[PDB]
Amino acid sequence: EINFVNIGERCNVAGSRKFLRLVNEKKYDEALSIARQQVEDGALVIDVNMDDGLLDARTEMTTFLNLIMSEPEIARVPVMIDSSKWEVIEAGLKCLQGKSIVNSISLKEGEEVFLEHARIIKQYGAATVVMAFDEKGQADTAARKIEVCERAYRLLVDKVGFNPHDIIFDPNVLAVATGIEEHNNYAVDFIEATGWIRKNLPGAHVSGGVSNLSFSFRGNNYIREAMHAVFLYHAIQQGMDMGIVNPGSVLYSDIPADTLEKIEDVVLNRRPDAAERLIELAEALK
Numbered sequence: 001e002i003n004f005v006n007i008g009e010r011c012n013v014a015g016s017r018k019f020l021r022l023v024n025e026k027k028y029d030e031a032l033s034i035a036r037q038q039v040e041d042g043a044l045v046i047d048v049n050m051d052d053g054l055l056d057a058r059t060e061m062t063t064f065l066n067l068i069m070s071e072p073e074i075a076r077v078p079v080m081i082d083s084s085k086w087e088v089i090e091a092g093l094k095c096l097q098g099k100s101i102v103n104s105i106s107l108k109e110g111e112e113v114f115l116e117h118a119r120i121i122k123q124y125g126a127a128t129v130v131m132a133f134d135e136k137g138q139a140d141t142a143a144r145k146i147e148v149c150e151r152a153y154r155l156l157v158d159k160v161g162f163n164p165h166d167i168i169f170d171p172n173v174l175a176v177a178t179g180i181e182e183h184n185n186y187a188v189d190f191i192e193a194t195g196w197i198r199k200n201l202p203g204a205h206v207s208g209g210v211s212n213l214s215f216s217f218r219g220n221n222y223i224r225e226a227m228h229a230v231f232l233y234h235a236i237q238q239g240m241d242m243g244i245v246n247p248g249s250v251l252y253s254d255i256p257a258d259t260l261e262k263i264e265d266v267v268l269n270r271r272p273d274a275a276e277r278l279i280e281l282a283e284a285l286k
C-alpha cells in the first residue's frame with residue numbers, strides 16, 4: 001500500500017446522497033469539507049462528479065473546482081474530473097490551473113472521438129483514465145479488458161504522442177454476487193487484466209471504482225468494506241496502483257479467518273455457492 005494512490009470517491013452526487021443534497025442546497029462550504037476530510041484521511045486525488053438530472057453539471061463542476069483552488073489544504077492534490085459528458089470535462093479542464101485528471105475517455109463512441117478527446121487532454125497537460133469500453137461494449141472478461149486496453153495504449157502512444165505515465169486504465173470493477181452466474185468471475189477478471197497491463201503496457205497505471213464491487217451488499221457496510229480490503233489485497237499484488245475508494249476502515253489482516261474465507265470465496269470465485277454463503281452471513285449480521 002506504499003505504492004497505492006487512494007482517489008477519494010465521496011464528492012460524487014450519484015455516489016453520495018449527502019454530497020448531492022449539499023450541492024443542491026448550495027451548501028458549498030459543507031460540500032468542500034467532504035473533500036477536505038478525504039485529503040486528511042489520505043486521499044491523494046479527489047474525484048468530483050456532478051452528473052445528476054437535478055443539476056447543471058457543468059456549472060456545479062466549475063463552481064466546486066474553483067472553490068477547491070481557493071482552499072490550500074485541498075488544492076494541494078489533483079482533482080479527477082468525473083463526468084460522462086464531454087462538455088463538463090472540458091469545462092473542468094479550462095477551469096483548473098494545475099494538472100487534473102480526466103475521468104474518463106473510452107472507445108465507446110469510436111476511434112475518431114477518442115483521438116480528438118485525447119488530443120485536447122494532452123494540450124491541457126492532463127492525465128486521463130481510459131475505461132475498458134469499446135465500439136463492441138463494456139469489457140467484462142479478462143480477454144476483453146486486455147484487448148481494449150492494449151489497443152487504447154497503442155492509439156494513445158503511437159497516434160497522439162500521449163505520455164504513457166499519464167494513462168490510467170480502468171478495466172471495470174463490476175459487482176459480484178448479483179444472482180447472475182455470468183458475473184461470478186468479475187473481480188478475478190479485473191485482477192487478471194491488471195496483471196497483464198502492468199506487465200505489458202509500459203508506464204500505464206491501473207485504477208478502478210472499488211465500491212462498485214460490493215453493490216449487492218448495500219446496507220451491510222462491514223461486508224462491503226471487507227470485500228474492498230480483500231479485492232485490494234489481491235489487486236495490488238498484481239500491480240493495481242490507484243483506486244477510487246472511500247478513504248475513511250476494515251483491514252485485511254483483521255478479518256476473522258472464517259469470514260475471510262467467505263469473502264475470498266466470492267471475490268476470487270472459488271466455489272459456485274460462494275455468493276449464497278456470503279449472503280447468509282450478511283443476513284445474520286443485520
Ligand SMILES: CN1c2c(O)nc(N)nc2NC[C@@H]1CNc1ccc(C(=O)N[C@@H](CCC(=O)O)C(=O)O)cc1
Nearest residue numbers: 009012015016017103129170173208209211212218244
Ligand atoms: C462507476 N464508478 C467509477 C468507476 O468504476 N471507474 C471510474 N474511473 N470512475 C467511476 N466513477 C463513479 C464510480 C466510483 N465512485 C463510487 C462508486 C460507488 C459508490 C457507492 O457505492 N456509494 C454508495 C452510497 C453511499 C451513500 O449514499 O452514503 C452506494 O451504495 O451506492 C460511491 C462512489
Ligand SMILES: [K+]
Nearest residue numbers: 016017018019
Ligand atoms: K452519504
Ligand SMILES: [K+]
Nearest residue numbers: 211224245246
Ligand atoms: K462505499
Ligand code: NA
Nearest residue numbers: 052053055057
Ligand atoms: Na444534469
